[PDB]
Amino acid sequence: HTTYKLVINGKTLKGETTTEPPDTNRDGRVDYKDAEKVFKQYANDNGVDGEWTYDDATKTFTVTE
Numbered sequence: 001h002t003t004y005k006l007v008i009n010g011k012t013l014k015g016e017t018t019t020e021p022p023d024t025n026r027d028g029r030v031d032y033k034d035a036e037k038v039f040k041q042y043a044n045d046n047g048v049d050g051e052w053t054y055d056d057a058t059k060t061f062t063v064t065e
Contacts, residue, residue, distance in 0.1 A: 004035035010065040
C-alpha cells in the first residue's frame with residue numbers, strides 16, 4: 001500500500017491522520033485519489049468541512065477553514 005497523510009487546520013476542528021486504502025487492484029501501490037475519498041469519509045465522520053488541497057511533492061492532504 002501507499003501511505004498518505006491528512007492535516008486538518010480549521011477554526012474549531014483540527015488534527016492529523018493517515019490511511020492506507022486497500023489495494024484491491026493488486027497494483028502494488030495506491031493512488032492519492034483513493035486516499036482522498038477515504039480521507040473525505042474521515043472528514044464526514046468527524047464533521048470536518050473546509051478547503052481541500054494536495055501536495056504532489058510530499059503526497060500530503062490538507063484541509064483549512
